[PDB]
């Protein structure tokens, strides 16, 4: 409810607020809470046509069960460190949320799974406002009536296989709280550029050296900073992706960013190398020089392999590292 108040403020419509009172999971029933909150979303917000179009416009791609499709019981359930680099500009906030929830759904079929760690990054003004609505939905989905906080990861058991989960929502509100020692007054500006680097600052402070094994990349808002290629490149740079990390890029809209991402991931080493250098001569200026894009440039020597493709939705895996 506290969330509903901050929502009405951030120009968010009544829809979302209302939902957080019609939201109730049955702790008794055979059908898991994640599936219960999953259906309640499609029911209240009517994601029936939008999901159909999200499939149709992507060559009837099973947007529905993207992981279940390519991976097998073992491969899917083995993935334990997931980083979802934003929400897609092409889909609504609920469809994005629904997708997030559905990813976890696929990742937790078995009961013989080592604990899951899912990180969701809400990197722009448009999505950040829904982080607390997202955490409340997750608190239900995972059923954290096991034993919510303003800041912090949500822990619980999730999916058909009651898999141990720890959901981390990384956003600007959490970043502003952190910096000011959780002081009441957080009303100061923070740019999405500043944000990417404080994330990197937290990872470097937190002692995190467990590698990402599933990278969800999409058509984030504020392309200038939140660029997919630039996102991939930085993770490549920092030794953050597992040797056999899977990379899923998903969207409807096809643009120059998409072609470039596709040409880098899918490109021969000479190609990759020249791209890194061409960008560097073209985009680096003495003012620009300090940006994270000029320090964390990518590694042309990382090799990928196409594992799945259906027009605009693709899975590639890291195949090897040339040295």
């Amino acid at each position: 409810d506290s969330i509903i108040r901050d929502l009405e403020r951030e120009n968010v419509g009544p829809e979302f607020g209302e939902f957080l009172n019609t939201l109730q999971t049955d702790l008794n029933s055979e059908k898991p809470p994640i599936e219960q909150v999953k259906s309640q979303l499609e029911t209240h917000f009517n994601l029936a046509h939008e999901t159909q179009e999200f499939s149709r416009k992507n060559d009837n791609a099973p947007v529905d069960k993207l992981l279940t499709n390519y991976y097998n019981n073992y491969e899917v359930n083995v993935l334990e460190f997931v980083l979802q680099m934003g929400f897609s500009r092409d889909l609504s906030i609920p469809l994005n949320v629904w997708f997030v929830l559905d990813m976890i759904s696929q990742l937790s079929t078995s009961k013989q799974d080592l604990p899951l760690d899912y990180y969701l990054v809400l990197n722009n003004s448009q999505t950040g406002k829904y982080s607390d609505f997202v955490r409340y939905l997750i608190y239900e989905a995972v059923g954290a009536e096991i034993h919510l906080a303003n800041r912090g990861p949500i822990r619980g058991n999730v999916g058909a296989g009651d898999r141990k989960i720890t959901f981390h929502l990384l956003c600007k509100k959490t970043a502003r709280m952190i910096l000011v020692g959780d002081d009441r007054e957080t009303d100061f500006e923070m740019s999405d550029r500043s944000f990417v680097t404080l994330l990197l600052d937290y990872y470097q402070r937190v002692g995190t050296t467990k590698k990402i094994d599933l990278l969800l990349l999409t058509n984030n808002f504020d392309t200038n900073m939140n660029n997919k290629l630039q996102q991939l490149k930085i993770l490549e740079s920092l030794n953050m992706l597992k040797s056999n990390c899977y990379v899923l890029d998903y969207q409807i809209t096809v643009d120059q960013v998409t072609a470039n991402f596709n040409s880098y991931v899918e490109g021969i080493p000479a190609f990759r190398r020249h791209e890194i250098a061409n960008f560097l001569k073209k985009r680096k200026t003495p003012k620009n020089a300090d940006e994270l894009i000029f320090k964390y440039v990518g590694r042309w020597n990382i090799c990928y392999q196409k594992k799945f493709h259906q027009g605009n939705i693709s899975i590639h895996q890291i195949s090897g590292y040339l040295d």
């Binding site: 002081d183 009441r184 007054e185 009303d187």
Partner: protein, 49 residues
């Protein structure tokens, strides 16, 4: 009355000064006009009245 402030005063004025700005922002007519004070080494907002 003259000279550079001592170590404690440098801390006291800087910290109470930041809180004074916060107290301005954190205001509404319902919340009374404060005096930024110090009590058990803790900055407190006492009422001016």
């Amino acid at each position: 009355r003259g000279g550079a402030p001592c170590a404690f005063d440098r801390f006291l004025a800087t910290v109470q000064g930041v809180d004074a700005v916060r107290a301005v922002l954190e205001s509404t007519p319902a919340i009374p006009s404060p005096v930024i004070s110090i009590l058990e080494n803790k900055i407190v907002r006492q009422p001016l009245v």
